[PDB]
Design brief:
alpha/beta, 20 helices, 20% strand, membrane protein, 20 strands, homodimer, 47% helix, binds 5'-O-[(R)-hydroxy(thiophosphonooxy)phosphoryl]adenosine, six-stranded mixed β-barrel
Chain lengths: 650, 650
């Protein structure tokens, strides 16, 4: 049969000066289930090292330590953690509780790592705290408890996963006489109930509370004797404490890891706020710059949209003056448009003049732009008729006073729902009857807001301007033919048709393309400058997480001792970083949205802010990725701590 | 006569639940110089509270406490610190040493806070450490010392500033039996030497080391009896330890505050690196963006300086399509420049043609752009002659083969130091004699880097091109007399000479002004976005400083008890932040300079990086201001800590 704790020729060496020093020197030691063992020696004796090895927090480097038959010498971290969850509970001189949790929570932690039903572990935690006289202090934080009360909490914690072997490191060293007596009473009562208890001390008067006293000095055991305490006659057991013992639970520990990181945020609200603030400012500047560049691009493009697709505009305008010295040189005339119409690369053509008059209806007045155009103009610019129809070529010839109106003029003058078609409006001093309504090119509520009116160019030229010439001529190029080659043909045709190079062009597609390219490139560079800010925010996240790993070093050690896997610690800290970056990426998005409405109020007619939902999604994802990347390094550093050095980190 | 410590009616209340609780209930107590006093009681007794008041770390809050006649009831923090420096030394259960310093440094700290000569305090530190058996461990850090060794370090520390009244709070509570014997031996020997010692404990067997035992319970003193230790027979005194003891010095404490901040940076090197890194990225991005916008503006403007000042260039339309359409439609001819010459607003005028030929010298060849210009061209464009002169008007008439060169061609062909003037070079197939060298308009190279040659336009048109027309004509407007009106007048005149409006103009000053304003505006917007990054860096600095205040809370408390003023603490932390941000600004500047040299390797001849020295200085100042500001709140929070709560922070 196996003895519960079986040590054989245990040698623990440490390197010291291109050589070694033995701290444990060939220790043989058998401890049976139910013994009350005290191991006593002074500083330097090796009692600590021995207990660390006994608690599966360290490995021999020479010898054998079998826990219920299981050799620990060659076990890997999660296997030793398995043994700690299975057979050991720990009590520390300084009563290492987790300041952020309640007594109940600290008691639960080992059951969290062992994968114990949360309802059942709640029951067990409050039951053990009540059994040890802390039934009314269940919800107190460690900062709300006295030393003895905290040590009683950690006794209940040690009992959570069974309490098979309670390893107690000088429990009565920090706290006073009375509460030391109480702690020792509890331990002896647990031993009476069958709990194996190993007490490590330097005060023989503490060791005398045990039934077996092993004395250690300079790495070797020098005494091993039974003992009967004197105070067993006073402390009669009038309060009979007898309380001995691929995809499933990973989810439970992930839920708890989220909860734990969340509580660490609630504990340090200023720190959390500042770190999130850095991420909020970063994400907000990136989403803002991107939406500003996109919306401004769309706005500038709509301001071009008064031109068509495959549209070549033929301008010639310049300085003003007399009829004989300026008008005689205005060679662009509608006969030129008639000539262009017959070219194999021209699918549509329209002269274009314009004037601005006061438009009247029953009582309304409003200034409006009256465009003198061809019946084909709507075909050139791609305008869509809402209700009516265009001009007849005859009505252009006959100087008709028919008129086409856009959506904006309908809103201005026919807000009642009165059908504009057939209604006579008055343009300055010229009456005109509406024969059609056009849906504009504009994309946006307040991106255009102008009143466009369309009459035959012959009528506007004759009745309103008194001129024989055209402001410009728009041409839509056939067959998707090379608009540039058609452009050159137009320049040669009109130039040969005129007496000289009296014209210049505007290629709508070329200008649009240049605007898209230039605005896109500038958007990319500037939003990269914003991403620099976001990078600095991420660096801040990493630095804070690393520092909180240092802060929580002892918490990490305690969690390991109670049963945490390196995985579990990694998940805990990494989830903290991720949650911090997400909560703040969302707030950066919302801040950017509010700032977007601010700009959309106070901006001009070129600056506009438009938020693509995939830039919002990209913001959320890149915030989470900053959490995963920048937070990872600290979370791994926490997961890889030596629980011995962590427990004694001070 | 006055007793050293004179206590009367100490009542210490703390609020607890819409009421208060008395922790000291009217304590009277007289302690004379040289007494060895133990104050003993269990948790709740008030012994610590009493000892804190005795040490000038708290105020009676009701009653009187006189230290050598000085009432503490109404004293302000720095006055209580004065009393601590004057009369008190402190020893703590956990032997609160400063992990970053050596034993010697920890011993020095109280002398730093007092007005003590650094050399003399070094001597005292090593002397006291040698007296207490730490002569060979003088340089060890606290992590390199045992509990007893650290406790002897803090004994020497308490003795540094005199050791008048040594308050020891459970000194033998953390450490083992043997080293407790040694600590108590040392304390008794100091008492024999005359030191007043007040020992506070809960273990009567420790209290029995004193000669006077005052027992306290539930806030009141219940026993006060003399005592003779049992070990007075053991200690025959064979080793007689008898060692009893704003413009001027503010600068010395500033030196020490700088040194302490520096050592704290060395202690946490990764933290320092990351915190500094944020500022480095911020300052580098801002200085980089500013230098990029400024230099690019200078480059793009240099490409315009070739258009001269107040110069209106008369360009002409394509005019091509055929060789016969070139002959037909190239209406801009040098006679038009002759006509422009006579106008009242034209001070100088030049036709301009250009072609590219291979420029040859003795054996050297390089392709060069030959500009056919008027003798006035240099006045219009504002070019300055380095050595020679321009053409004669006669030589323009006579189709002269004179040539003027720029500095780039001088470098290409006359690198020897050979004077180009009088030398005959060959341009394609036309020889030409150099009559002058011209210094260009440009500052940065960018795209030019071009070989410019100037010959009479009549000669280039006649001999090299075989054409009757001019590419464009430049005019310099006198007095700046309505250059915009001159543009229109030129168009009207040239249009009147031709058969149409077949010419257009370009106002050099308008273009320059537009470029200057637009690029300047882009510089401000983008560099503001970089400053966003710098802001996030500062926020990170603040968060880190708050965290290091929390981390060092006990260090702050120990410093206060040892004798630090709130001033001293604030200076310490403020200097830390300032120093980190200052260095991060310097490194941000150096990174920015390197990045500028990197950018200058890019293929964009429009992007250029120019560093103003006032943006470097601005970087230094704004980095230091981030240090002071963010930067400040943590340092004040450190200075305003309650030294009692700070010392008991865990
Ligand atoms: N890294 C390391 N390096 C060198 N020596 C070590 C190390 N770790 C432990 N030891 C030794 O084990 C003992 C630890 O606890 P003990 O209870 O025996 O005395 P303490 O004062 O440390 S509580 C101590 O006496 C040390 O001499
Ligand atoms: N903020 C505060 N609030 C309420 N009560 C306080 C407070 N501070 C001290 N006290 C009391 O004074 C005593 C402190 O030291 P003592 O040596 O007498 O016992 P300890 O267990 O704290 S070492 C302690 O027993 C407490 O009951």
């Amino acid at each position: 049969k196996q003895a519960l704790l079986e040590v054989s020729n245990l040698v623990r060496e440490f390197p010291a000066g291109e050589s070694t020093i033995q701290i444990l020197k060939g220790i043989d030691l058998t401890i049976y289930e139910g013994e009350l063992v005290a191991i006593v020696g002074q500083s330097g004796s090796g009692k600590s090292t021995l207990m660390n090895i006994l608690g599966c927090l360290d490995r021999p480097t020479s010898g054998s330590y079998k826990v219920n038959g299981q050799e620990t010498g060659k076990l890997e971290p999660d296997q030793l953690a398995q043994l700690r969850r299975e057979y050991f509970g720990f009590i520390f001189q300084r009563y290492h509780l987790l300041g952020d949790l309640s007594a109940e929570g600290n008691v639960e932690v080992p059951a969290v790592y062992a994968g114990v039903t949360p309802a059942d572990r709640k029951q067990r935690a409050t039951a053990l705290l009540t059994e040890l006289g802390l039934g009314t202090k269940t919800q107190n934080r460690p900062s709300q408890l006295s030393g003895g009360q905290q040590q009683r909490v950690s006794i209940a914690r040690a009992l959570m996963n069974g309490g098979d072997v309670i390893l107690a490191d000088e429990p009565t060293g920090a706290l006073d006489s009375h509460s030391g007596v109480e702690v020792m009473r509890i331990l002896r009562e647990l031993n009476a109930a069958g709990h194996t208890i190993i007490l490590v001390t330097h005060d023989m008067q503490v060791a005398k509370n045990a039934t077996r006293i092993i004395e250690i000095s300079d790495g070797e055991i020098i005494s091993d004797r039974p003992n009967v305490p004197d105070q067993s006659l006073e402390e009669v057991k009038s309060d009979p404490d007898a309380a001995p013992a691929a995809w499933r639970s990973t989810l439970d520990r992930l839920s708890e890891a989220f909860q734990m990181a969340l509580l660490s945020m609630n504990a340090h609200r200023m720190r959390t706020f500042l770190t999130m603030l850095g991420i909020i400012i970063g994400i907000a500047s990136v989403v803002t710059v991107v939406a500003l560049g996109n919306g401004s691009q769309q706005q500038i493009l709509s301001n071009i949209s008064s031109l068509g697709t495959n549209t070549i505009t033929v301008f010639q305008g310049r300085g003003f003056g007399d009829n004989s010295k300026t008008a005689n040189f205005k060679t662009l005339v509608p006969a030129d448009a008639d000539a262009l119409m017959t070219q194999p690369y021209v699918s549509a053509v329209s002269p274009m003049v314009s004037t601005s008059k006061t438009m009247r209806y029953q009582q309304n007045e409003a200034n409006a732009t009256i465009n003198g155009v061809s019946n084909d103009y709507f075909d050139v610019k791609g305008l869509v008729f809402k209700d009516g129809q265009t001009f007849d070529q005859r009505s252009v010839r006959d100087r008709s006073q028919d008129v086409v109106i856009d959506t904006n003029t309908q809103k201005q003058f026919f807000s009642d729902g009165t059908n504009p078609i057939g209604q006579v409006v008055l343009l300055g001093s010229v009456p005109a009857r509406i024969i059609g309504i056009v849906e504009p090119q504009t994309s946006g509520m307040g991106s255009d807001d102008t009143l466009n009116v369309y009459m035959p160019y012959t009528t506007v030229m004759s009745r309103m301007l008194g001129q024989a010439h055209v402001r410009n001529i728009v041409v839509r190029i056939n067959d998707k033919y090379s608009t540039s080659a058609a452009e050159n043909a137009i320049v040669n045709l009109l130039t040969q048709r005129h007496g000289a190079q009296d014209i210049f062009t505007m290629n709508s597609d070329s200008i649009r393309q240049t605007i898209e390219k230039t605005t896109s490139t500038m958007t990319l560079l500037v939003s990269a400058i914003a991403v620099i800010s976001l990078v600095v925010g991420g660096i801040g996240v990493m630095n804070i997480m690393l520092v909180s790993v240092t802060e929580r070093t002892q918490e990490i050690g305690v969690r390991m001792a109670v049963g945490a896997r390196q995985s579990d610690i990694l998940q805990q800290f990494l989830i903290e970083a991720i949650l911090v970056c997400l909560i703040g990426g969302v707030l950066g998005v919302l801040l950017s949205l509010g700032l977007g409405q601010l700009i959309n109020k106070f901006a001009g007619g070129n600056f506009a802010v438009a938020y693509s939902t995939t830039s919002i999604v990209a913001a959320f994802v890149c915030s989470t990725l900053i959490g995963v990347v920048f937070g990872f390094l600290p979370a791994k550093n926490a997961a890889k701590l030596d629980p011995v050095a962590a427990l004694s980190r001070e």
